[PDB]
Design a protein around this motif. Structure first.
Motif, PDB file in Angstrom:
ATOM      1  N   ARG C 143      -0.601 -41.521  57.772  1.00  0.00           N
ATOM      2  CA  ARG C 143      -1.326 -42.711  57.274  1.00  0.00           C
ATOM      3  C   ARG C 143      -1.442 -42.680  55.738  1.00  0.00           C
ATOM      4  NH1 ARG C 143      -4.362 -44.106  63.103  1.00  0.00           N
ATOM      5  NH2 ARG C 143      -5.717 -42.357  62.872  1.00  0.00           N
ATOM      6  N   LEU C 144      -1.699 -41.517  55.117  1.00  0.00           N
ATOM      7  CA  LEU C 144      -1.676 -41.392  53.652  1.00  0.00           C
ATOM      8  C   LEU C 144      -0.294 -41.729  53.091  1.00  0.00           C
ATOM      9  CD1 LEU C 144      -3.150 -40.642  51.068  1.00  0.00           C
ATOM     10  CD2 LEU C 144      -2.555 -38.233  51.541  1.00  0.00           C
ATOM     11  N   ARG C 145       0.784 -41.209  53.714  1.00  0.00           N
ATOM     12  CA  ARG C 145       2.159 -41.556  53.313  1.00  0.00           C
ATOM     13  C   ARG C 145       2.452 -43.038  53.369  1.00  0.00           C
ATOM     14  NH1 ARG C 145       3.534 -35.331  54.635  1.00  0.00           N
ATOM     15  NH2 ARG C 145       5.138 -35.929  56.132  1.00  0.00           N
ATOM     16  N   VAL C 146       2.049 -43.674  54.471  1.00  0.00           N
ATOM     17  CA  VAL C 146       2.175 -45.143  54.607  1.00  0.00           C
ATOM     18  C   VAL C 146       1.411 -45.949  53.549  1.00  0.00           C
ATOM     19  CG1 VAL C 146       1.638 -47.076  56.187  1.00  0.00           C
ATOM     20  CG2 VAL C 146       2.704 -45.003  57.028  1.00  0.00           C
ATOM     21  N   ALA C 147       0.189 -45.504  53.252  1.00  0.00           N
ATOM     22  CA  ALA C 147      -0.629 -46.154  52.232  1.00  0.00           C
ATOM     23  C   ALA C 147      -0.115 -45.924  50.812  1.00  0.00           C
ATOM     24  CB  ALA C 147      -2.028 -45.618  52.359  1.00  0.00           C
ATOM     25  N   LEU C 148       0.258 -44.688  50.416  1.00  0.00           N
ATOM     26  CA  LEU C 148       0.851 -44.482  49.089  1.00  0.00           C
ATOM     27  C   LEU C 148       2.195 -45.192  48.985  1.00  0.00           C
ATOM     28  CD1 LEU C 148      -0.015 -40.759  48.706  1.00  0.00           C
ATOM     29  CD2 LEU C 148      -0.867 -42.668  47.270  1.00  0.00           C
ATOM     30  N   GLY C 149       2.946 -45.195  50.092  1.00  0.00           N
ATOM     31  CA  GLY C 149       4.223 -45.900  50.148  1.00  0.00           C
ATOM     32  C   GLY C 149       4.086 -47.397  49.887  1.00  0.00           C
ATOM     33  N   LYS C 150       3.034 -47.930  50.494  1.00  0.00           N
ATOM     34  CA  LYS C 150       2.720 -49.341  50.321  1.00  0.00           C
ATOM     35  C   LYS C 150       2.229 -49.674  48.908  1.00  0.00           C
ATOM     36  CE  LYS C 150       1.446 -51.059  54.086  1.00  0.00           C
ATOM     37  NZ  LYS C 150       0.799 -51.806  55.141  1.00  0.00           N
ATOM     38  N   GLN C 151       1.379 -48.838  48.356  1.00  0.00           N
ATOM     39  CA  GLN C 151       0.896 -48.979  46.993  1.00  0.00           C
ATOM     40  C   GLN C 151       2.036 -48.866  45.967  1.00  0.00           C
ATOM     41  OE1 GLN C 151      -2.463 -49.415  45.691  1.00  0.00           O
ATOM     42  NE2 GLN C 151      -1.102 -50.010  44.127  1.00  0.00           N
ATOM     43  N   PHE C 152       2.929 -47.899  46.171  1.00  0.00           N
ATOM     44  CA  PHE C 152       3.999 -47.679  45.207  1.00  0.00           C
ATOM     45  C   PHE C 152       5.383 -48.177  45.581  1.00  0.00           C
ATOM     46  CE2 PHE C 152       0.719 -44.506  44.284  1.00  0.00           C
ATOM     47  CZ  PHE C 152       0.349 -45.034  43.055  1.00  0.00           C
ATOM     48  N   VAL C 188       2.121 -41.092  38.634  1.00  0.00           N
ATOM     49  CA  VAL C 188       2.714 -42.373  39.048  1.00  0.00           C
ATOM     50  C   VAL C 188       1.628 -43.455  39.072  1.00  0.00           C
ATOM     51  CG1 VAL C 188       3.929 -43.630  40.834  1.00  0.00           C
ATOM     52  CG2 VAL C 188       4.395 -41.151  40.517  1.00  0.00           C
ATOM     53  N   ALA C 189       0.452 -43.089  39.621  1.00  0.00           N
ATOM     54  CA  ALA C 189      -0.692 -43.988  39.682  1.00  0.00           C
ATOM     55  C   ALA C 189      -1.098 -44.460  38.292  1.00  0.00           C
ATOM     56  CB  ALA C 189      -1.851 -43.285  40.309  1.00  0.00           C
ATOM     57  N   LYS C 190      -1.368 -43.520  37.370  1.00  0.00           N
ATOM     58  CA  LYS C 190      -1.753 -43.857  36.000  1.00  0.00           C
ATOM     59  C   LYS C 190      -0.715 -44.701  35.296  1.00  0.00           C
ATOM     60  CE  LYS C 190      -3.488 -41.761  31.641  1.00  0.00           C
ATOM     61  NZ  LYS C 190      -2.483 -42.172  30.666  1.00  0.00           N
ATOM     62  N   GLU C 191       0.566 -44.448  35.519  1.00  0.00           N
ATOM     63  CA  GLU C 191       1.634 -45.208  34.882  1.00  0.00           C
ATOM     64  C   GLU C 191       1.739 -46.627  35.368  1.00  0.00           C
ATOM     65  OE1 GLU C 191       4.602 -42.222  35.678  1.00  0.00           O
ATOM     66  OE2 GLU C 191       3.384 -41.048  34.296  1.00  0.00           O
ATOM     67  N   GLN C 192       1.292 -46.796  36.603  1.00  0.00           N
ATOM     68  CA  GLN C 192       1.350 -48.112  37.178  1.00  0.00           C
ATOM     69  C   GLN C 192       0.030 -48.855  37.223  1.00  0.00           C
ATOM     70  OE1 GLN C 192       4.120 -48.326  40.541  1.00  0.00           O
ATOM     71  NE2 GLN C 192       5.016 -46.496  39.864  1.00  0.00           N
ATOM     72  N   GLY C 193      -0.990 -48.401  36.497  1.00  0.00           N
ATOM     73  CA  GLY C 193      -2.280 -49.102  36.503  1.00  0.00           C
ATOM     74  C   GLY C 193      -3.148 -48.868  37.747  1.00  0.00           C
ATOM     75  N   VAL C 194      -2.871 -47.840  38.544  1.00  0.00           N
ATOM     76  CA  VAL C 194      -3.683 -47.479  39.683  1.00  0.00           C
ATOM     77  C   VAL C 194      -4.600 -46.334  39.268  1.00  0.00           C
ATOM     78  CG1 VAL C 194      -3.559 -46.616  42.075  1.00  0.00           C
ATOM     79  CG2 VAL C 194      -1.964 -48.268  41.236  1.00  0.00           C
ATOM     80  N   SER C 195      -5.870 -46.675  39.192  1.00  0.00           N
ATOM     81  CA  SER C 195      -6.896 -45.735  38.792  1.00  0.00           C
ATOM     82  C   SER C 195      -7.266 -44.664  39.798  1.00  0.00           C
ATOM     83  CB  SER C 195      -8.160 -46.491  38.453  1.00  0.00           C
ATOM     84  OG  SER C 195      -8.861 -46.969  39.608  1.00  0.00           O
ATOM     85  N   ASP C 196      -7.899 -43.574  39.382  1.00  0.00           N
ATOM     86  CA  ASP C 196      -8.383 -42.600  40.357  1.00  0.00           C
ATOM     87  C   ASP C 196      -9.395 -43.151  41.379  1.00  0.00           C
ATOM     88  OD1 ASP C 196      -6.908 -40.286  39.377  1.00  0.00           O
ATOM     89  OD2 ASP C 196      -8.342 -40.087  37.783  1.00  0.00           O
TER      90      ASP C 196
END
Ligand SMILES: NC(=O)c1ccc[n+]([C@@H]2O[C@H](COP(=O)([O-])OP(=O)(O)OC[C@H]3O[C@@H](n4cnc5c(N)ncnc54)[C@H](O)[C@@H]3O)[C@@H](O)[C@H]2O)c1
Ligand SMILES: NC(=O)c1ccc[n+]([C@@H]2O[C@H](COP(=O)([O-])OP(=O)(O)OC[C@H]3O[C@@H](n4cnc5c(N)ncnc54)[C@H](O)[C@@H]3O)[C@@H](O)[C@H]2O)c1
Ligand SMILES: NC(=O)c1ccc[n+]([C@@H]2O[C@H](COP(=O)([O-])OP(=O)(O)OC[C@H]3O[C@@H](n4cnc5c(N)ncnc54)[C@H](O)[C@@H]3O)[C@@H](O)[C@H]2O)c1
Ligand SMILES: NC(=O)c1ccc[n+]([C@@H]2O[C@H](COP(=O)([O-])OP(=O)(O)OC[C@H]3O[C@@H](n4cnc5c(N)ncnc54)[C@H](O)[C@@H]3O)[C@@H](O)[C@H]2O)c1
Lengths: 318, 307, 307, 318
Positions: C143-152, C188-196
């Motif tokens: 489920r984490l893989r699916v969610a990070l996959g979807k986000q990125f 990857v998150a920081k580079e794409q505007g996805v905050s902690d």
């Protein structure tokens, strides 16, 4: 071999054996694949090239070995054999390949191997019978490729003629694998309808079907004329038979089997429908050939019989 | 091409192109596969041999063709060639008729030297950078994965490791960004008695593997036939899968205006985005040095080409 | 079981067990599949329904059985259950007859709470640790893989990321050891505007996903039926693949004598080895805290049924 | 839909539609799967559950949608239906399902959709004809599941009786899908040999074959008695037909197709062998039934046509 781990030994690393191994790597069938051939360095280079397919397909332990590696193998596939030279006779192809075969089988059996033999070396019906004879194995544990390659070429050709997937063409090439062989059209169907009726219906004459059958019979010759050798079809066919064995499928395949009365034949291996599973050949299925087709089959078998026996007699002329 | 029917054209039917075609047939990827080469008999014979795999794998329309057959192809894979100059010459004879056929799908370039010929395919075709993908370090990354897998008794597909640099002798194992089960390969190595020297020998094996296979059996093609099938699958099944490919550098690794090997996300429109492996300072120096000769040779070959 | 013929016994035919069996049928993994449960008429009916999948997938001998059918099985998958005390009770009724049948393959345990019941299956069976594998955090890591996959906009299979801790509410995304194309997910998150904070909400989504699916459709089973098919594949095809499973801690992460979720290598003999994800100091504290609670509840339940 | 990206819309998320979607996820067929149902939160919860299969199978964009999402879909699969109640008549099952169907098809077509319909809602031959009629689509772009599930149950049964893989049993259930249906044994084969000859040969009587055929006919009923519902077989059959379409295979499958003379039938959809490919149904193949089997088929069809027209007549009674 060791828990949940199947082991195949390939004897004969030429283009057939090698494209078989690559097909087995693309398909993730068996977990350990040993390559044996007299040209040892060839087998070390091919294991290294083949094992690179693993990063993108499925893990497999591929390496170069010797006959002793057959000890705990589940399947030994014999593709080793010499080609027929210009000026050479058919009985001499038989002669040298029986010689090569007798050098393979005895050390394979002496390793303690007791799995199944799959024989694809040409001429395949003769060499499958001789592998049975030399190994002393039960008939069901020695399977030849019989007419599997040519039956696939007939399926591809009928598929192409009738705009159907080859896997939906239920058709067999019968007889001994070369020139005396024929398309068993009387027992051939697409969607349970007879190929001859589909043909007539669509404007494809019996003459057209005869030319199509000729194309199939000459296809090996034409591919060798165009590119020098032919190996993708039999590498695939050998993977499909290995899959039916190793995944215990009881699948119906064109293979070479020991005749025990079927088609009016005896004590020869020849191409048949048969059920293949984890113990080897489960049973032969006799295609209900027309009287004409059965005459062809018996004629072809009669001469195969003659050549099998000359070959073997000459092998014991010491 | 026509409804629910994908079309790949292979330009270059030698052992690489042919084992790629066979891998595509075993995998049931694409429905029509055209084989194009100068030596027409070979391609005619290979289409016949290849098509016999269909009775036991999946249907595919495989035949011998010409560049005009690229008109409505989705993917053109260039494996043709024999060095920089002769291959740039062969390439310029391929790309212009492929684009003049009206083709507007994706180029996958595997002809050697692959980074130079991938950039030249981009330059000669006039396509967007994302529609020209090279095999980059995919083959040698696989060989690294197989070797680390063997060393550590792990499936090669669970080794997250890349070969970086230009594809031959100046290339290196990017060990600082390599992992198995998220643990750094150097730590796994330490934990198991495998020294950095051992890892350097292992990297050497990978770098010399093509040479050793050619010495033992004359040619090497199974690994790149498979790698090319995997990139083709990511494209044609629109996967957005992360693969080792050759991509146009636009600042990444401090590089600009060359194609070179990177992690990148590949999907139905081609390269979706480059992912810059966070290389150690040492590994980045090696990458930039390797890249620096590339730019000189590439440009020598492109300027040579026009005289 | 008999030549070239693998045998799996499923104990527990509810929606999880049943969708697992269906996934094993779509995948052609194992040649014989026995379904064992308290309600025999459900297992009978499911074997009949499942076996109809064969005409279009791959042959499989599927039938309803009893614990004695485990005698020569290669894998027994326990999905049976109903909290800690009722499931330990159900488990103790399953394991003893499965072992008394003469079974000596591998146990794969998916019954909830999975870490506690995996340890208890090891304890009640007397099997080696490596022959008792739990599903651990495989479903939530997916489920984490699916969610990070979807986000990125990446394929989930290219997201190298694990959920750690005991499987529910105290669990967390091990972001410090997570990567996409070898680049850290936080970069990857920081580079794409996805905050902690965004990553914290994403992690919350994963932790609440079971609850949300049960609220919308009543039950959740496809993800764990798939994960159980993947672990079964790594075992039966001897892959030595790296998977999220539950394994016995023997010092790893500072933990001992509990089963908990880890990266580990899985093959034909069971668990080959545990791989300790190099967690950040914060993530390791979370893991140890989560584990400390697991370990209390485990020894309480086990002491309770020893009464 | 967008480059190298196929899109399927499922209308009807009950157990059949949902196990179909799961089978499509395990097989990696199609890149986008939309779930549509009147029960919206159920389609949301199932998309979430289903998408978790991706980490270990193949990527797929799975989500809950509406009929407007059919605009650029390649395939719409209709499994939406209401079950027959105790005491309710066969024509009332037809009646409510025609009503449900008319609420589905018109918005699906108004979205601009022009791919293929695959219809599995029961009673399937009636609802496949009505989907053709309500959509105004070409007959080849409207395909029903026809006798594909029951033909698989016959293949599984003959496979089990004769120790053969079900995929190697070339056998069809014919007639309208329930109680009037029969095993077309006269055109059935294993390894090209007639099933009746294999049977006779192995001590399986025509009575035994009649009981076997009864088992197949009653299997839905028996599964529902044992576990409450039956959905794995038709979820797989629907994935296999979707695969033949989306991978343009021209594969021969049991589907429901529009009769235009075949079997002596007209203006009904019924179960046939047919070739399925990327444009839909490529062509019907008429199984050469024995005279007895053809009488059964025509009687079964005569009564389906009667119920068909009764239901469509009541749907027009406003
Ligand atoms: N059964 C079929 O339908 C079918 C169809 C086509 C080809 N094949 C057959 O497969 C066989 C091999 O074809 P190929 O393309 O691999 O040929 P190839 O000539 O490229 O290689 C044959 C291999 O046999 C090996 N060999 C010869 N003598 C040896 C010995 N004494 N011991 C061990 N190995 C030895 C060689 O070293 C070589 O690697 C042939 O006999 C061929 O006709 C089968
Ligand atoms: N990218 C990688 O990592 C990788 C690795 C190994 C090999 N390969 C490369 O792929 C290429 C082919 O390798 P091979 O081993 O198959 O060699 P090869 O030379 O046998 O095959 C390439 C074929 O291209 C053909 N060709 C030449 N000019 C042509 C033209 N103008 N148009 C169409 N076709 C033409 C030739 O007839 C030739 O056989 C080489 O450049 C090789 O180095 C790629
Ligand atoms: N490990 C994970 O990550 C994960 C995730 C979700 C669900 N599951 C778990 O798997 C189990 C099954 O879930 P479900 O959705 O199928 O629910 P369920 O309640 O329908 O299934 C439990 C099954 O166990 C059976 N059972 C009870 N006692 C038994 C016995 N003595 N012998 C044989 N069978 C017995 C029940 O009849 C039932 O079929 C639960 O404990 C559930 O929480 C695991
Ligand atoms: N073709 C075959 O051989 C075969 C075999 C078995 C079952 N099926 C059929 O598949 C269908 C569904 O079976 P199931 O077990 O999934 O059923 P189910 O009762 O579990 O679900 C049916 C679905 O249809 C939906 N529905 C009803 N009215 C609606 C409307 N107006 N618009 C949109 N959706 C609506 C419901 O909300 C529900 O989710 C049935 O008609 C059944 O007979 C086909």
């Amino acid at each position: 071999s060791m828990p949940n781990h199947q082991k195949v030994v390939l004897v004969g690393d030429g283009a057939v054996g090698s494209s078989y191994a690559f097909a087995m790597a693309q398909q993730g069938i068996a977990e350990e694949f040993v390559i044996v051939d007299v040209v040892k360095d060839r087998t070390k280079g091919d294991a290294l090239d083949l094992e690179d397919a693993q990063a993108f397909t499925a893990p497999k332990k591929i390496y170069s070995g010797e006959y002793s590696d057959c000890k705990d193998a589940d399947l030994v596939v014999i593709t080793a054999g010499a080609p027929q030279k210009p000026g050479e006779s058919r009985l001499d192809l038989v002669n040298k390949n029986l010689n090569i075969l007798s050098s393979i089988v005895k050390p394979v059996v002496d390793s303690g191997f007791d799995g199944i033999f799959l024989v694809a070396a040409n001429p395949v019906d003769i060499l499958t019978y001789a592998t049975w004879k030399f190994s002393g194995f039960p008939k069901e544990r020695v399977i030849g490729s019989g007419t599997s390659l040519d039956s696939s070429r007939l399926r591809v050709a009928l598929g192409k003629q009738f705009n159907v997937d080859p896997r939906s063409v239920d058709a067999y090439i019968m007889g001994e694998h070369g020139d005396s062989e024929f398309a068993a059209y009387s027992t051939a169907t697409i969607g349970t309808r007879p190929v001859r009726d589909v043909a007539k219906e669509q404007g494809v004459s019996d003459d057209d079907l005869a030319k199509l059958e000729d194309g199939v019979r000459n296809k090996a010759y034409d591919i060798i004329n165009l590119k020098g050798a032919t190996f993708y079809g039999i590498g695939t066919a050998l993977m499909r038979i290995s899959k039916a064995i190793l995944r215990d499928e009881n699948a119906v395949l064109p293979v070479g089997a020991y005749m025990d009365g079927q088609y009016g034949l005896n004590d020869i291996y020849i191409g048949t429908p048969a059920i293949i599973g984890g113990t080897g050949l489960k049973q032969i299925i006799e295609s209900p050939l027309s009287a004409d087709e059965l005459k062809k089959m018996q004629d072809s078998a009669a001469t195969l019989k003659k050549v099998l026996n000359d070959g073997l007699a000459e092998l014991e002329n010491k």
